[PDB]
Amino acid sequence: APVFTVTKFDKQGNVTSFERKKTELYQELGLQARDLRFQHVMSITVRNNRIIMRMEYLKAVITPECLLILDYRNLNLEQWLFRELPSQLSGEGQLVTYPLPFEFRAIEALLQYWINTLQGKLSILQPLILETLDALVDPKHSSVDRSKLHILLQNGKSLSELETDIKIFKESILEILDEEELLEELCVSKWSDPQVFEKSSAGIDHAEEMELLLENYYRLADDLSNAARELRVLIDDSQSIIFINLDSHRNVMMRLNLQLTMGTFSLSLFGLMGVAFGMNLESSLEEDHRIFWLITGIMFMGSGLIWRRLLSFLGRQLE
Amino acid sequence: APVFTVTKFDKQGNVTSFERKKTELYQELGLQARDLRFQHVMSITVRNNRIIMRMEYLKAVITPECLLILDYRNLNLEQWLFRELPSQLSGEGQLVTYPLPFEFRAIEALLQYWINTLQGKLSILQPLILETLDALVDPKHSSVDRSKLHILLQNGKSLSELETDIKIFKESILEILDEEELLEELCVSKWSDPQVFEKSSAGIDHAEEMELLLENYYRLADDLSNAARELRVLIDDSQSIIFINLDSHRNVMMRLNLQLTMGTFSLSLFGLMGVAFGMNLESSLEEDHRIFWLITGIMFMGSGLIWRRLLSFLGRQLE
Amino acid sequence: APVFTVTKFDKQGNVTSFERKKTELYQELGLQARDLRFQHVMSITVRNNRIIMRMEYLKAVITPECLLILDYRNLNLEQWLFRELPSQLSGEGQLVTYPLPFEFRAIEALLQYWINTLQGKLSILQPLILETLDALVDPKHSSVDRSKLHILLQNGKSLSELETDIKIFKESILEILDEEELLEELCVSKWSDPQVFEKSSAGIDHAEEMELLLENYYRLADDLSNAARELRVLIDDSQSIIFINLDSHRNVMMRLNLQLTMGTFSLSLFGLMGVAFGMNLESSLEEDHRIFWLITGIMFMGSGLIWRRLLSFLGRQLE
Amino acid sequence: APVFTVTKFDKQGNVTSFERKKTELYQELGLQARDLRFQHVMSITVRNNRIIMRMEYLKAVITPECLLILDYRNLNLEQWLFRELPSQLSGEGQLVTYPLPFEFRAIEALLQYWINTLQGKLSILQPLILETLDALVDPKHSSVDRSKLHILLQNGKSLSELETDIKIFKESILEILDEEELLEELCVSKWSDPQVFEKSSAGIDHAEEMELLLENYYRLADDLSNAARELRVLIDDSQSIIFINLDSHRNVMMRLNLQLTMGTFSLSLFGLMGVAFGMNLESSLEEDHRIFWLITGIMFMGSGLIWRRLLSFLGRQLE
Amino acid sequence: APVFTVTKFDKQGNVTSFERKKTELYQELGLQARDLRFQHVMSITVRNNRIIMRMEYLKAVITPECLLILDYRNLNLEQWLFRELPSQLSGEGQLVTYPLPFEFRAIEALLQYWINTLQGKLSILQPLILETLDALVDPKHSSVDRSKLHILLQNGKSLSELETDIKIFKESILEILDEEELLEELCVSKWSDPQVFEKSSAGIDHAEEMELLLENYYRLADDLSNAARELRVLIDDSQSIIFINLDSHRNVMMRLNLQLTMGTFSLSLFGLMGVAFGMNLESSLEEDHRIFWLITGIMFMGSGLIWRRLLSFLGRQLE
Ligand SMILES: [Cl-]
Ligand SMILES: [Mg+2]
Ligand SMILES: [Mg+2]
Ligand SMILES: [Mg+2]
Ligand SMILES: [Mg+2]
Ligand SMILES: [Mg+2]
Ligand SMILES: [Mg+2]
Ligand SMILES: [Mg+2]
Ligand SMILES: [Mg+2]
Ligand SMILES: [Mg+2]
Ligand SMILES: [Mg+2]
Ligand SMILES: [Mg+2]
Ligand SMILES: [Mg+2]
């Protein structure tokens, strides 16, 4: 029989970790089997007055009386759970929903944890990508470091995954915010005992508070998405600049090679003249003395003149 | 007369395969000819209290009493139909709509099959594309394997087709979910005998259950679309990295070729000097003895010095 | 005075072709001059209980009693009109709106013709583009065929035009479908004599039938748009693969040229040694016999060793 | 004191050009200072029953009795104003709003002028861009004409500006059309004396006529936007084809250079053999006669054989 | 205890700068701690009849009686605050909301300052980017200046950041404008003493004035966004033109190098002939006199002929 590893935080912040059979959990929470399938990444739903949330590896069930974290093992959640959550829920944590019922504090804690995780991913990726791009777009490098290219590719893949996570988080929060029915449903304590809260709520609107909390987290996620999109745009612009730099270096090297090739061609032409005039054959110019110096002088001078003329021709061709 | 190859599953899960004339099928189902044209890929409609669904090659008609699969031959559907569907509909299948009427189970089975097909396509494409990209973006390869390029092109075309299929599936599900009239129409058993279901429905809302089922499948398809889009983005980034790697290797090879060309040019210049000074002509320096060693020494030393000067010039040019 | 070449199909399918002055046509149809300007490509409007449709070169006016096609000459419409339209309207055509009034049949015929035209354009473009891309992305070609590149460019321009046509058709159909007022207006026979159709309509809803017809054609156009977009994406991916193939071939050729340049450089260095040691000058090593063989042997061996060392250096540089 | 150069057209089409202080204009029109700031490009608003329109350099105020054009000098508007506008408003112009009040004619004239301006810009840009692209994508050119590249860049910038203008025009017209309140406000003559027009309007709806006019101009602008987007897509496709053509020409030239380099390498190897065997040193093979012919024959034959072997090696490498 | 550096402007324009503990500020403004967290860039909200605005570094709280600027130090805001704001609020400033209550003037001043900041950023970036692109796309440059490339990259990053800022400003203004509840909430003076303003408002609608002000600033931001997008499109087009120019220069240089390589190959072939015929070996053609001139003449003529034939071959290959 499948089981859930459940960490339960009550309204008093006490932590109880145990394992419970899935059928027993369904019976306790008043939920069906399909409700706790957790097959969707980044899904927030309300079933039978219970808030089922899944943010990647974080699966949570919020009740009017307690919070349950499921399948928390082997995820490095022990520090976060057993240090922050008791303090955030029933201590001096940074949560600003203390006068509000427990579900507001639980939702705020979960959304704050996910926002902090996304912010940490972005704040790890951004300096690495920035320094890699700065190293790569250096104008004085003829060629780029390919190990840094592999690092940039891995970081870009991580950035795309992070951007997708931010996008789906924003989509879920926005689709919850758009409909007032979902906002009303999220107030589980209000609907658990509506008769009690008809007079308990001394002019305070739970739906308004939930809307404000979700809007705050949506705005934070929107800022994260804008930063990630800016980073992606910077990556693309840096890649274009790298392409232009490599092409410019190629053109410079090609121009130098062409000039040297013109020089070599002129030298080879007059070397052909010299070797043709210096083969082991009887001629009528061996007796003359000035002929050797005249030939070598005209060879060198013509090589220089042809090289200069070819350089001028290249300059005219390239304008 | 055109005919349909019909596989019928009753509410008890019994399977009956036969062939029926199209007019007879229209008369039996209370449908017109235009309803069963099946000319749209990924279309879900409700006509005369019958649910007509088409997911590419899968054409189905859901009635309050039975499910019909049409044109199922030569599509490798025999295994799925004759093994899963009886168990899913009237057995111990994974469907979570057993207390719900038959149309809920049929819709769940069809949507689950299509989602599984898309997931299988994605899970086949993803490892192949990942390994091909990993092989191609290897920084230590001067040139890429073009057979792997052809494989990557074919897999990218398949990925684009899969992404289009996921997109149209999401569009159909979302356009059904947006309007409450369509959700009400999908509950064919409710509207077949409204008087009976006015009291049969003991506080259970069929429209709500249909909305939950369609939302679950829409979220699954959204996850699939996000994964496919991430794969496409990774393909594009890998292609950019491949371009940068190839350009960097070209620049390195060009720099080496330019250095060797400078060396060859210096050697050719002083070889021109030597061949000019070594032609079969009478000169005034054959008698001298130190002249030969002086000439060869200055030739070699000048070749080296000119090569070093040209190397420094290249270094200055490339900064 | 400007005139219209009018082809009129009555409810009985009879065809009458003539020419009529524009003012006379306005008086007959009960329309103003601005209604029949036909200045918008792909526009469907209802003015004075008349349906004015324009699909590029096809201008039509649908009345409760007749259909008019205007400016049909020099457009290869004679075959379509004078063969299909009588059969589709008042024969055994594939139209599924025979029990419906005449305007439904006319709208179905026009939309079917336009959908068939778009499908024919796509089915002509797709095999040509596919075969051109298959020829171009061949991995064993060092260079691509530029005539095929020109053909691909022309076909891509045609594909973009077709995609724009499909997009505007979808936009017009969707904007008609979104508002129920437009759907009600399209039923010209219903509003021509509302008193008669108040009892003539035996439980059949004209607006619902019009909505179904327009939805069917919108779905067909959506499938066409998806196919065209897939073709464009395939074109872009093939272009990227062509770029990678060309760069890889360039890198391979550059590596071969660099190896041959290293060999030539070593040969030229030791040829400089030989020519320097073989100039017409008196030396102290002409008397020796083993010196010639020693010099040539060390020249060849050193050329080989330097070539191998430079090859190893290139291998180290390219990793 | 700032002043406006005002050209006023009455309902009778008479033209009066003058200059008026801004405060006097505000008092006459019953408008505040902020209404006539004209700080937004392509803005259509209704303030105090006056229609304030700005289309780039064209600033207009439409009153129930007159039309005012402001800051018309030094804009080449004299021809358009003083030739078209009197005829369009109170003559035989192409306006189709003569039975409608004056504001309909004024709005039609202004929108027609702006649409004509955009159409003229597009009809000037399109042939130039088309001919430049046709010249540039010529497959038989090894290199492209860079002056034509500069012309294409300037025309592309102009096309982007025109596309932005069309987009903002469409946005303004669509945002006016979406809300019925704005359509009602645009009928300034209706709201100037509502008691009079309560009986003056003999069954004619001013809001409907305004909606039809704005829809017509929106459709014209949509056609313009589609044409401009098609032109941009064609520019991008042509640039890609140019890239492929240049890379293919580079590959062809590189293959030729590599073949010639292989030939030169073989010739240089056997030239090294010859020069080593032809240095001024005493050897044991000068006496023999057949040795010279044997050496030269084997040199030439080996050069040819090595060249052919290297050509085959290149063919194998490039497949 | 954390404190705020508060600059307060009353309705009379008087400026008072001080520091106040955060709890004291919360008590004075009737706000909770979470309201003044200022964790969202570009957020406009209304809490407890107070307008909380944050535009990057500018944090402001608008009350019906006063305006507060928080954390204004070390931001170069002293000039703007202490020179413009007193004049804009209670002087001869350009604000057009003097008859309106104080909150209208404060909102107008803040939005005007942010719009001016964005306009200044755009007007600084645009000339720099334009001149850099004009320098880079010069057709007569074989290679581009890489320092200008780095400058262009930095300016493009700044432009992307500015475009993101404009986008978020537009999004906030538009989401405020879409809902009438937010527009009503922004009129803090109206809701502070509704009984007084029930008769104080002599036919003037505060919500309408707020909507007009926000629409004006939204249109200004839309113009800014259009200009920034045009600049980005121009940057991309210029980069494409730079790529084409570099490739064309590469092709020209490669063609010249190939022609010179063909010439060098022909010269080297006939130099091989000469050196083979001029080695120190006994032959049967030393006695002849015309043989030397015949050999050198045929060598030169054949070199020329082979060079011309290879040039023709290249011309045929490149078409
Ligand atoms: Cl290249
Ligand atoms: Mg992921
Ligand atoms: Mg909201
Ligand atoms: Mg497909
Ligand atoms: Mg929903
Ligand atoms: Mg000699
Ligand atoms: Mg067209
Ligand atoms: Mg509908
Ligand atoms: Mg390239
Ligand atoms: Mg402009
Ligand atoms: Mg409308
Ligand atoms: Mg920023
Ligand atoms: Mg509004």
Residue numbers in the entry:
A (entry chain E), B (entry chain A), C (entry chain B), D (entry chain C), E (entry chain D): 83 to 401
What text does the study give?
Eukaryotic mitochondrial RNA splicing 2 (Mrs2), a homolog of prokaryotic CorA, anchors to the inner mitochondrial membrane and mediates the influx of Mg2+ into the mitochondrial matrix. The overall structure of the hMrs2 channel has a cone shape, and it is assembled into a pentamer with a central pore in the middle. The pentameric hMrs2 structure can be further separated into two parts: the N-terminal funnel domain within the matrix and the C-terminal transmembrane domain in the inner mitochondrial membrane.
The hMrs2 structure was reconstructed from the dataset in the presence of 20 mM Mg2+, pH 8.0 (hereinafter referred to as hMrs2-Mg); from the dataset without the addition of external Mg2+ or EDTA, pH 8.0 (named hMrs2-rest); from the dataset in the presence of 1 mM EDTA, pH 8.0 (named hMrs2-lowEDTA); or from the dataset in the presence of 5 mM EDTA, pH 6.8 (named hMrs2-highEDTA). In the hMrs2-Mg structure, four Mg2+-binding sites and one Cl−-binding site were identified. The second Mg2+-binding site (called Mg-2) is located in the pentameric center of the matrix part of the hMrs2 channel, positioned immediately below the inner leaflet of the membrane. The third Mg2+-binding site (called Mg-3) is located in the middle high region of the hMrs2 matrix part within the interface between two adjacent protomers. The fourth Mg2+-binding site (called Mg-4) is located in the near bottom region of hMrs2 within the interface between two protomers. The Cl−-binding site (called Cl-1) is located in the pentameric center of the transmembrane part of the hMrs2 channel, very close to the inner leaflet of the membrane. Of the five ligand-binding sites, three sites (Mg-1, Mg-2 and Cl-1) but not the other two binding sites (Mg-3 and Mg-4) are located in the three other aforementioned hMrs2 structures (hMrs2-rest, hMrs2-lowEDTA and hMrs2-highEDTA).
